[PDB]
Amino acid sequence: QIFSSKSIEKVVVHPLVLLSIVDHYNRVARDTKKRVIGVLLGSTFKGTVDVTNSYAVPFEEDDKDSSIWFLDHNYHESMFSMFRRINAKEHVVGWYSTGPKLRENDLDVHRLFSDYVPNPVLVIIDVQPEELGIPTKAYYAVEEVKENATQKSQKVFVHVPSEIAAHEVEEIGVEHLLRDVKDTTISTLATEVTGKLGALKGLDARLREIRSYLELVIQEKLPLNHEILYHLQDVFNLLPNLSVLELVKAFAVKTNDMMLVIYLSSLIRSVIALHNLINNKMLNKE
């Protein structure tokens, strides 16, 4: 009964936020490897963080001393007041980071920021995404009490699902921006086959990465957090036997049924297409 702080179930990240963050990175870090930081504004409902608006909050971090990081609260609270005046519905929800990876001082940023929100969310956005997927990864700090006595309670960032949805107005603007590229005529299969194939490129590469890390453990360079190795062993344990015989007949039956339904569909399309071809011959002769 101690965890009275509503756990953050999911975070919804909308385009305007990403566009603002990208423009911030460009203006502040087009030609430097410095990261740009800011504050996330919105409303939290039923464990879901609606990240509606965000604004630039200038950031420095010494290229020599990562522990040192120039961000200040004057403009922060000034903008809280000013934006809340503009839109009283919104309130601060988190602080965003523009980069591929976390840094240790992200923890102290989260600590300082939680004074403004009891449950703040850290969102890492890769301004130059190379991977095929959502460019946002959500985090919230959890005080994990390790079973080892010699270490004090350490705050560890725990991943939360992050999703991208666009309001009707944002959806309208996005399509208006994406007409020169986007595809709506794709028959659903092309999309689904592409997604499955991309997923296969994902899982097999993930297995290869685990294998690389296992060879690493063999050499004796990197150990592993008991929990994640536990998870890999769990995945292997839940492996169903693909050589299950009655299960094989189950495959055969479903395959026959589905493919003969497809056979129905092909027959009916034959009917209609031949009908229309004959009508075309009629219209051509007349």
Partner: peptide, 10 residues
């Protein structure tokens, strides 16, 4: 020094 590198306006 950690806290004086706590800067909004650079």
């Amino acid at each position: 020094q950690l806290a004086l590198k706590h800067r909004q306006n650079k």
